[PDB]
Amino acid sequence: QITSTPIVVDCSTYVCNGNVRCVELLKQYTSACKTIEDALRNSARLESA
Amino acid sequence: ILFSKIVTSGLGTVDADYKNCTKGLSIADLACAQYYNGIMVLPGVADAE
Amino acid sequence: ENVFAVESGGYIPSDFAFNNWFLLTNTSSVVDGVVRSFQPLLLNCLWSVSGLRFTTGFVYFNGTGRGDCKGFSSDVLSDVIRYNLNFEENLRRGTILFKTSYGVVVFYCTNNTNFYCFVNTTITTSAFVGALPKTVREFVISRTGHFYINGYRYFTLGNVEAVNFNVTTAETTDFFTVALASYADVLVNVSQTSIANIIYCNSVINRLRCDQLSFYVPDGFYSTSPIQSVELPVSIVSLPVYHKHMFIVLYVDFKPNITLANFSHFTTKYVRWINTGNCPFSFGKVNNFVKFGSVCFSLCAMPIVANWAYSKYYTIGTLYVSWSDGDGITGVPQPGVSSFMNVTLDKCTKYNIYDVSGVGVIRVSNDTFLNGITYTSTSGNLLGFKDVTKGTIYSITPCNPPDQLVVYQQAVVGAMLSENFTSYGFSNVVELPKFFYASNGTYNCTDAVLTYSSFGVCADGSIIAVQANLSIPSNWTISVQVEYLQITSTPIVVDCSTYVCNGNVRCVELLKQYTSACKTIEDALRNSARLESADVSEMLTFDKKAFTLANVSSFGDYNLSSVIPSLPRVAGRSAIEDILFSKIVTSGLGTVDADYKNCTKGLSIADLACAQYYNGIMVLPGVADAERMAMYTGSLIGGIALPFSLAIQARLNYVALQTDVLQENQKILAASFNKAMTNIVDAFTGVTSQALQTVATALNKIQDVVNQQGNSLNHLTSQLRQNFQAISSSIQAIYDRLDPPQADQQVDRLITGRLAALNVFVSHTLTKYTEVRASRQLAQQKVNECVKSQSKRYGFCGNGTHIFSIVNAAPEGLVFLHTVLLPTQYKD
Amino acid sequence: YDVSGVGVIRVSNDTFLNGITYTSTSGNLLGFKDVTKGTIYSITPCNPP
Amino acid sequence: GNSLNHLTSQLRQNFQAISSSIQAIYDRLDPPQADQQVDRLITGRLAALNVFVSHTLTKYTEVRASRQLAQQKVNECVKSQSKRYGFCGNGTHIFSI
Amino acid sequence: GNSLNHLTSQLRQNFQAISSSIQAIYDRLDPPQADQQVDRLITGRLAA
Amino acid sequence: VINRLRCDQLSFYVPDGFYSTSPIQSVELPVSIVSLPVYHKHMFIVLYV
Ligand SMILES: *[C@@H]1O[C@H](CO)[C@@H](O[C@@H]2O[C@H](CO)[C@@H](O[C@@H]3O[C@H](CO)[C@@H](O)[C@H](O)[C@@H]3O)[C@H](O)[C@H]2NC(C)=O)[C@H](O)[C@H]1NC(C)=O
Ligand SMILES: *[C@@H]1O[C@H](CO)[C@@H](O[C@@H]2O[C@H](CO)[C@@H](O)[C@H](O)[C@H]2NC(C)=O)[C@H](O)[C@H]1NC(C)=O
Ligand SMILES: *[C@@H]1O[C@H](CO)[C@@H](O)[C@H](O)[C@H]1NC(C)=O
Ligand SMILES: *[C@@H]1O[C@H](CO)[C@@H](O)[C@H](O)[C@H]1NC(C)=O
Ligand SMILES: *[C@@H]1O[C@H](CO)[C@@H](O)[C@H](O)[C@H]1NC(C)=O
Ligand SMILES: *[C@@H]1O[C@H](CO)[C@@H](O)[C@H](O)[C@H]1NC(C)=O
Ligand SMILES: *[C@@H]1O[C@H](CO)[C@@H](O)[C@H](O)[C@H]1NC(C)=O
Ligand SMILES: *[C@@H]1O[C@H](CO)[C@@H](O)[C@H](O)[C@H]1NC(C)=O
């Protein structure tokens, strides 16, 4: 096996399914999105390089 | 032959093509079902070419 | 005067110092940190009125009464009025007057009756309200009636039309600025509970910054979903039924008389003096197509509660409902056959199709499925439906699915999309095999900077794919190239008990039942930190004599002045590293230095480094201390010095004998060296396409690497607010409210939450370390292959023919100053 | 101010205008103002690790 | 396939909310109680997402070893004759494609 | 040792459910509510 | 103290290293309260059994 296929997720769209009020409420979970999607983006970058 | 013998899994597609996704002409195939949840399968690094 | 011209669009001019603009709050003002919040900071007017012209003079929220606004004006309804004073007698004398929809209110304060403050009200009555703080200097009123002093909400007046002063200055020096404000939402750099500076969440890039809590943005492919329309048309689809209606109407009358009339479809009506109670539905909201099998109403319990001034509550009665689940009862917005089907295509539309409710864009589809009526994905979202009246199949695509942006030099250059039209103000759209790509570039560029797995984007945003006598150069130029490699991560350790139980002794004594939970966490952290310290400690060799060969005199015409580690300790940091450490903006989210000597001595309120220490998040001292790094790098520099230009000439000789060690060429190459050195120190200090772009990349990568640690730390220290479905977020408050039997049944939720939080944070740590390890091994390899040696491959040690390389300390990392030769000024 | 807790209370020489209760990101109180005298009392937990 | 299905199916469960659809919640109740409903869903979604991250990171670190091995095996047995038995197959190596 | 102990001890916690044991919880309640009770145990055990 | 630590390790041997610990707060504590001024109109509720 040489490579997986990199995946990326988008926090707010997954969690709130696009309800604007839910997204306004998700701001209270400080950095709760950042630390997920960063841990996916950086690994995808490493796999590509 | 290998590419024909190995069968993709209906649990989740692992390569997707987004450009037709928002056109609405048809009910979405599994790739756009995922894409409406923000799961965005990226193009594989090692293209067959 | 620090008074300013507000710019068109209501922006504060970015260099304003805010020297009295307190951040307003209803509670618990913060000490330090980046916050994202709504605040009244979009200004319709600011005018400065000096003591020469203090007069009585009301202001309405419609802006009438305003003075000569400075710089800009607008006539929208402002929501708030902010008064910034400069005269110390403040509100101690004179009075504030207010107009309300049913009377007049006046605020005054008196000591001789400290200044205890009172209100007079006429539809006449008076009330005690509070006491004047030591010096009011800024104060604010909301149109809804909240009154704020020095940022804190003291009382409410209800809705107010206009505000007025019976006030005069003490001296001709004095003036006050009055400004009409409305809410923006903003990112604020708070320090010492002062504002330092802000950014508005206006533009897209500012949306990113406003939702990464980061003033810097790295380069990379950040995703977003564009904001939806504030309003929607409504569509409804139903199965045809035999139509019949019942009104349910609740009548209220009182004096300090509730009745039900007559006490397949139905609807509900309700008709400074209703709550949902324990019912799993809300009166009125029942109309929103909730279902029941049957329903009964009687004078679960919905108490009807009168309020006075939002200050007293009186349960004037209770309505009881009983309901069965099932169908045949639904809300309907209006009261014998055939279903309505008001459906709008293309417009993003709230829908209730077959009692599945959502938002999306409905469209006609060419698909023809004989089975079914609604089609769903595995996630349970509605995808499409069949009009039973016709067999028409419709598809339910959500509006604004996520895009991916390309950010470079803190600008948006390009955007991948799933649709063929431009957006965001970009110019042209090209179709690539799996997506569209909008941008503003023109495709003349030939060299990318970002690599989307298999594509490049160049500075314009143009996507590019990537994969007889001779004109020998007459001369070879030298150039400099920079690599940054991360080499360590600063270990963190958590005291599991003091984090989870906050030190409350009952909680600590409860935690013991969570057998070995804390052990297997803190043990994983400790073991990682040991390994980190050992693996770095072993890597930093030394040799005293080899180091001592390094001195700036001992290099002739090649001016390494900025690299040679400074005279202290064996040494101090060298000038380039000094530049970097001053250049990198330290994170506002998580301080990764520590000093615990001060955290209890208490002379000043705890700064972040102690604030996160009280929860046990003990940042350990770094394993690669500055002095040791300087000593190592010095030993390397003296190693490569080991005549100083004669070794260089030996290399030039090898790469081209007859040209590159001619004395004139030697001198020229010394000049080229000094030039390149100067150009890079220029680029690091402030204001080339294969040179300074390397500097840009290294500064980006370093700022990124700092930022990602700060955010990992802030996740953990921010989950302490989260109440995990318990009565309240503070353990002490719970034990005050409950007897131990119920107290434990509540506190078990906080414990099972916070242990999840730690079992995540440990994962962030251990994966970060495993990413670092590969980098450290690679850096070691590059030390062996390309400073202590001469490279035998292009590219691996700079794009160029190898001559020599140089090593310096940097935030958690090493910088390699490679140098290489390039062909130049060809002759046939 | 209806925040209940345990701590050492100590007068502190730092002075501010804004606000009343000073709190960290974790929501622990770090110090409170005396409205009547303007001294700021810092709050420090007993037995930090 | 299993990893993606698990992730995209956690999205269906109700995590002790009244309903697994956010629009249903905001339709049925009044915002101050609907919020302390929806915070259950939000926490459950975040949990599942943070599991899926760990599936991805483990899969990457497991494949990294295999890739580095494959690059070693090619650097041997195609660019050269092999110099040992067994490493590139039971028998005496000649070449590999 | 500690790894495996931390695994096996999670069964004792009731995860806010009425009881830490499935038989008891399914005995004392009616199925359409015992089921959404035991949901809590399921989710807790999976996270462990 | 070392036994107090062992009781947290659930082990009779404690490998050499650095371990985090916290001393124990005292068994009795002064109550202290601070409040804004308010108009007072105290009421009793007294239940008799
Ligand atoms: C302190 O608490 C009060 C309420 O507890 C906050 O006042 C509320 O502020 C929001 C926005 O800041 C107001 O919402 C606005 O209402 C108008 C109604 O016409 C609407 O047009 C706007 O689009 C927006 O929805 C809200 O009405 C107002 N009052 C209440 C009772 O909610 C105040 O902001 C809080 N202060 C801080 C610093 O948090
Ligand atoms: C947030 O504001 C603080 C000041 O309140 C900034 O800290 C200062 O920043 C300047 C640069 O503008 C440095 O020269 C000072 O040494 C810093 N002093 C202190 C005490 O912090 C901080 O940099 C600001 N944050 C950002 C991202 O700009
Ligand atoms: C504000 O409202 C009052 C009464 O509605 C009116 O007299 C006044 O002229 C208004 N101001 C402006 C600028 O329209
Ligand atoms: C109005 O305020 C004044 C002082 O500002 C006070 O003397 C007077 O009693 C107040 N009016 C009433 C009706 O209490
Ligand atoms: C792109 O170009 C057009 C016209 O040149 C301009 O209106 C638009 O703002 C530009 N956008 C960016 C991001 O450069
Ligand atoms: C796709 O976009 C290009 C330009 O971006 C345009 O010329 C072309 O007509 C579009 N094709 C379709 C099918 O929309
Ligand atoms: C090198 O450059 C610095 C820059 O200020 C200069 O002061 C110094 O004289 C130069 N030469 C040496 C040998 O350091
Ligand atoms: C830490 O304590 C020492 C004691 O001398 C003091 O000099 C230093 O300034 C203190 N640090 C801070 C941030 O107050």
The three-state (H, E, C) secondary structure of C483-545, written as one string: EEEECCCCCEEECHHHHHHCCCHHHHHHHCCCCCHHHHHHHHHHHHHHHHHHHHHHHCCCCHH
Which residue is closest in CA terms to ligand 7's atom 14?
Answer: C561
Strand partners, C221: none
Q: How far apart are CA C84 and CA C755, in angstroms?
A: 47
Q: How far apart are CA F42 and CA F28, in angstroms?
A: 18
SS3 state of residue C179 = strand
Non-local (6+) Cβ contacts of C401 within 8 A are A13, B21, B22, B35, B36, C225, C418
Phi, psi of C631 (to 5 degrees): -60, -45
Distances (CA, A) of C178 to C154, C158, G9: 20, 21, 63
Q: How far apart are CA C731 and CA D3, in angstroms?
A: 11
How far from each other are the two terminal CA atoms of chain C, in whole angstroms? Answer: 68
Reference C274, options C244, C238, C248; nearest CA is C248
Q: C419-433: buried (b, 16+ CB within 10 Å) or exposed (e) per residue?
A: beebebebeebeeee
The three-point CA angle C549-C550-C551 to 5° equals: 115
Cβ contact C294:C361 at 8 Å: no
Reference C182, options C140, C219, C213; nearest CA is C140
Which pairs with CB-CB distance under 8 Å and at least 24 residues apart come from C62-66?
C63/C180, C65/C162, C66/C180
Q: How far apart are CA C101 and CA C158, in angstroms?
A: 9
Question: Hey, how many other C-beta atoms are within 10 angstroms of the C-beta on C761?
Answer: 23
Strand partners, C819: C480, C804
How much helix, strand and coil, in percent to the nearest 5, is found in chain B?
Answer: 25, 5, 70
Q: Cβ(C600) to ligand 8 under 6 A?
A: no
Question: Hey, how many other C-beta atoms are within 10 angstroms of the C-beta on C323?
Answer: 19
Q: How far apart are CA A19 and CA E11, in angstroms?
A: 15
Cβ contact C557:C672 at 8 Å: no
Which pairs with CB-CB distance under 8 Å and at least 24 residues apart come from C278-281?
C279/C321, C280/E18, C280/E28, C280/E29, C281/C323, C281/E28, C281/E29
How many alpha carbons lie under 13 Å from residue C72 in its C-beta half-sphere? Answer: 17
Q: How far apart are CA C437 and CA C412, in angstroms?
A: 13
Breaks in chain B (C–N beyond 2.5 Å) sit after: none
Tokens 């989870």 — which residue?
C500
Q: Which residues on chain D are in Cβ contact (under 8 Å) with G26?
A: 46
How far from each other are the two terminal CA atoms of chain E, in whole angstroms? Answer: 30
Q: How far apart are CA C796 and CA C449, in angstroms?
A: 18
Q: How far apart are CA D26 and CA D45, in angstroms?
A: 14
Q: How far apart are CA C279 and CA C569, in angstroms?
A: 72
How far from each other are the two terminal CA atoms of chain G, in whole angstroms? Answer: 48
Among the partner-chain residues C398, C711, C767, the one whose CB lies closest to the CB of A34 is: C711
Cβ contact E20:E48 at 8 Å: no
How many alpha carbons lie under 13 Å from residue C376 in its C-beta half-sphere? Answer: 12
Q: How far apart are CA A4 and CA C77, in angstroms?
A: 56
Q: C240-249: buried (b, 16+ CB within 10 Å) or exposed (e) per residue?
A: eeeeeeeebe
Strand partners, C303: C318
**Strand locations in C51-151 (E):** 59-60, 80-84, 95-100, 103-110, 116-122, 125-131, 138-142, 146-149
Cβ contact C31:D33 at 8 Å: no
Q: How far apart are CA C655 and CA C60, in angstroms?
A: 82
Amino acid type, A24: E
Token digits of residue G42: 């105290």
> Do C722 and A29 lie within an 8 Å CB cutoff?
yes
> Do A13 and C225 lie within an 8 Å CB cutoff?
yes
Which residue is closest in CA terms to ligand 3's atom 1?
Answer: C62
Non-local (6+) Cβ contacts of C635 within 8 A are C541, C542, C543, C546, C547
Q: Does E contact B via 3+ CB–CB distances below 8 Å?
A: yes
SS3 state of residue C430 = strand
Q: Enumerate the H helices of G1-49 as residue ranges.
A: 2-9
Q: Cβ(C429) to ligand 6 under 6 A?
A: yes
Q: Which helix (H) or strand (E) holds C259?
A: strand C258-260
Token digits of residue C4: 């300013």
Reference C460, options C481, C483, C437, C482; nearest CA is C437
Sheet holding C801-810, edge to edge: C472-486, C813-827, C801-810
Q: How far apart are CA C401 and CA C117, in angstroms?
A: 54
Q: Enumerate the H helices of C385-425 as residue ranges.
A: none
Q: Enumerate the H helices of C189-257 as residue ranges.
A: 204-212
Q: How far apart are CA C335 and CA C266, in angstroms?
A: 7
Phi, psi of C291 (to 5 degrees): -115, 155
Q: In a mutational test of the pocket of ligand 6, which residue from C416, C419, C420 has the highest number of ligand atoms less than 8 Å from its CB?
A: C420
Cβ contact C20:C182 at 8 Å: no
Question: Hey, how many other C-beta atoms are within 10 angstroms of the C-beta on F19?
Answer: 16
A32 touches chain E (CB under 8 A): yes
Phi, psi of C778 (to 5 degrees): -65, -45
Q: How far apart are CA C307 and CA C367, in angstroms?
A: 56
Which pairs with CB-CB distance under 8 Å and at least 24 residues apart come from C272-276?
C272/C102, C272/C158, C272/C308, C272/C309, C273/C306, C273/C307, C273/C308, C274/C250, C274/C302, C274/C304, C274/C305, C274/C319, C275/C302, C275/C303, C275/C304, C275/C305, C276/C302, C276/E29, C276/E30, C276/E33
Non-local (6+) Cβ contacts of C658 within 8 A are none
Pairing of strands C265-270, C245-252: parallel
Distances (CA, A) of C157 to C60, C130, C154, C594: 15, 14, 10, 47
Distances (CA, A) of C707 to C210, C318, C710, D19, G12: 15, 55, 5, 30, 42
Q: How far apart are CA C403 and CA C549, in angstroms?
A: 56
Strand partners, C464: C456
Among the partner-chain residues A7, A11, A13, the one whose CB lies closest to the CB of B42 is: A7
- Distance from the CA of C682 to the center of ligand 7, in angstroms? 14
Q: Which ligand is nearest to the CA of C423?
A: 5
Residues recorded for chain G: 49
Question: Hey, how many other C-beta atoms are within 10 angstroms of the C-beta on C620?
Answer: 16
Token digits of residue C769: 């370390």
Question: Hey, how many other C-beta atoms are within 10 angstroms of the C-beta on E4?
Answer: 21
| CA C781 to mean position of chain CA atoms | 37
Q: Is the dihedral angle over the CA atoms C15, C20, C23, C28 positive or is it negative?
A: positive
Cβ contact C160:C81 at 8 Å: no
C773 CB burial (10 A radius; 0-12, 13-18, 19+):
middle
Cβ contact A6:A47 at 8 Å: yes
Nearest CA in chain B to A18: B37
Sheet holding C392-397, edge to edge: C234-235, C349-351, C358-365, C392-397, C382-387, C374-376
Q: How far apart are CA C645 and CA C669, in angstroms?
A: 11
Q: C680-713: buried (b, 16+ CB within 10 Å) or exposed (e) per residue?
A: bbebbeeeeeeebbbbeebbbbbbbbbbbbbbbb
Q: How far apart are CA B12 and CA B8, in angstroms?
A: 8
C363 CB burial (10 A radius; 0-12, 13-18, 19+):
middle
Q: How far apart are CA C324 and CA C669, in angstroms?
A: 91
Pairing of strands C301-308, C265-270: unpaired
Residues recorded for chain D: 49
Which residue is closest in CA terms to ligand 6's atom 14?
Answer: C420
Cβ contact C464:C450 at 8 Å: no
B39 touches chain E (CB under 8 A): yes
Cβ contact C232:C348 at 8 Å: yes
Non-local (6+) Cβ contacts of E23 within 8 A are A19, C350, C357, C358, C359
Q: Is the dihedral angle over the CA atoms F18, F24, F27, F32 positive or is it negative?
A: positive
Phi, psi of C47 (to 5 degrees): -135, 150
Pairing of strands D40-44, D29-33: antiparallel
SS3 state of residue C808 = strand
SS3 state of residue C217 = coil
Amino acid type, C519: K
Q: How far apart are CA C46 and CA C180, in angstroms?
A: 6
Q: Enumerate the H helices of C686-720 as residue ranges.
A: 692-718
SS3 state of residue C599 = coil
Q: How far apart are CA B26 and CA C366, in angstroms?
A: 6
Q: Which helix (H) or strand (E) holds E49?
A: helix E31-77
